[PDB]
Amino acid sequence: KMAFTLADRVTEEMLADKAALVVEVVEENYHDAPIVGIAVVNEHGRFFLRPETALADPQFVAWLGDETKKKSMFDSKRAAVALKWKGIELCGVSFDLLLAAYLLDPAQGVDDVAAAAKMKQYEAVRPDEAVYGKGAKRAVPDEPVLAEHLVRKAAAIWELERPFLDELRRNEQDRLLVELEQPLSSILAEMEFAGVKVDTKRLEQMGKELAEQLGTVEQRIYELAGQEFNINSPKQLGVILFEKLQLPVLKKTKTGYSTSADVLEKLAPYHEIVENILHYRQLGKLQSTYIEGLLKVVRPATKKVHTIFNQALTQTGRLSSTEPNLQNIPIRLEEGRKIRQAFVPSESDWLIFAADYSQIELRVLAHIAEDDNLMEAFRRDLDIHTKTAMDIFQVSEDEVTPNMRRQAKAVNYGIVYGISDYGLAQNLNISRKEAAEFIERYFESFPGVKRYMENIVQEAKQKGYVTTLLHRRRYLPDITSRNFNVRSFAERMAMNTPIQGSAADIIKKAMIDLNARLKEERLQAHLLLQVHDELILEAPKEEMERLCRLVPEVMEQAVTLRVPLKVDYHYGSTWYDAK
DNA sequence: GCGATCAGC
DNA sequence: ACGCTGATCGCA
Ligand SMILES: Nc1nc2c(ncn2[C@H]2C[C@H](O)[C@@H](COP(=O)(O)OP(=O)(O)OP(=O)(O)O)O2)c(=O)[nH]1
Ligand SMILES: [Ca+2]
């Protein structure tokens, strides 16, 4: 029902200077994954190519790598990385339908061509799940069915580029697609393919030491409980704490007793078993998520882990990191931080270099709210978390402990993003009236932030959405809901999304500028990871001194705000030593 | 499969 | 009853 050539060899009319291209990788993790078929739609017609012929054809490989042969695609990073694993470079991607749909409305959750096409009343393509199936029944269909599906996706990309670009233009997002998200997609492809080297000997040794510490703590828990149980059984654990030992019940879940760490910490005066349960959970989290989980995904021959940065998933424009998630590697507790000693440079005599924005969301807030006092604080390069810690605990600067500062950091973000006196009192273990008076004093120091937060909620009600500094958009239909709780969540999204999303925009532009600068200086240094407000690179030891001046400057100059941007940086022999 | 939990930002 | 995530695991 759609005409196409099931081609046996590559022809010159397949290599036009503008085409929709489909390079199909069905496996969810596309690293080293098979390419199961290729489709090309252009002015001369529609073509399906088998990969084992197309990707060994030197003219087709040449066409893929030619920047001047422009390709429209959906999820071009998936294609670029799968091709890198075949030794083939993809260049010239000038339109990515996945990123275009994500920019127009992140809430759509668009994850295949059919879902994007449905945004523009295009329905002549099937969902990928309808073609490949679900779960244990998932499979590549017979060639004619596959070929028609890939050609139909290519034809959809071909037809949808103009209406998508037109809507992007009306939203002031066309440069956001073409100058920011699409260039970043190629950089992420390089980072994912490069991978991060892991010291598996060290991780395995930690895993063994962890397993015996686990056993010890576990016996102590059974000892303190007077019996044995499944410490991870909510029913049994709840039964132990709140029925056998008769500890107060401070919180319930939909299903029974809460045993979250904040509850257990509040029960510490009542019984020393809860501190052991906490320690046990923390150890088991390291063991199962970061020891076993990381060893499971390491490529054995290179000792590299290859994350996938999801660029079209979060509602604020942040990236996420999957399989493994390299944006939530422990750092907070010393036992957990040592996991980072296992993350090492990929060559000998190279080092890890890490640079991060200091308080970028609060600096962005000061700029957007034009709050006189908050702008002055950052113009003085004040550490607002220490200053808040001094006010909370009524101490002087040198008397601000690391834990006090971490607490004040959650007070700072909490208050500007709408925490209530109740939530603040519960976090600081102060009276609710004290917490409310503190919040009042906080907005007396920062009335521009208060005004901005009231204004942005009203702007979302009027427009139906909020935007970031680089014109990312989030629709907030619930902000006019009649249910108070549904409305309130939407109001806090209107307060938070433009700030968190603008900080996401800035670091993305910084990455693009950084790569252009590394290329211009002819450095071997390259990005490995982004962790929201941090960039992690590796480079020859002999490049570190140049990177100490280059990277912070690139990051600080990514945008110009009414307050300066501030970058801290470290380097060392492992990721551990680079912070 | 989902909710609770917890690791990061 | 501040926000944004992903992985594990028990299932009340
Ligand atoms: N709403 C909220 N956001 C947070 C919280 N903690 C971190 N974030 C987000 C906001 C920012 O995008 C980013 C900043 O967190 P960081 O740990 O990097 O601390 P920050 O830069 O504020 O200070 P520091 O690095 O310690 O000088 O992470 C929090 O408790 N609540
Ligand atoms: Ca930071």
Numbering used by the authors: 298 to 876
Question: Could you pull the original sentences from the published paper?
Answer:
We crystallized active substrate-bound BF polymerase F710Y/D598A with a 3′-amino terminal DNA primer and DNA template in the presence of Ca2+ and 2′-deoxyguanosine 5′-triphosphate (dGTP). Reactions were then initiated in the intact crystals by pH-shift from an acidic mother liquor (pH < 6) to a basic soaking liquor at pH 8.8, and reacting crystals were quenched at various times by flash freezing. Early time points show negligible differences in ordered density between the ground state complex crystallized under acidic conditions versus the complex after 1 h of soaking under reaction conditions, suggesting that the reactant state and ground state cannot be clearly distinguished in this resolution range. The conserved Asp-830 side chain, proximal to the nucleophilic primer 3′-amine at ~2.5 Å in refined ground state structures, is the most likely general base mediating this proton transfer. The lack of electron density for an A-site metal ion in the ground state and at later time points is also consistent with the expectation of a neutral nucleophile in the NP reaction and the generally weak affinity of aliphatic amines for Ca2+. Unlike for native phosphodiester catalysis, only a single metal ion cofactor is detectable by crystallography during NP catalysis.
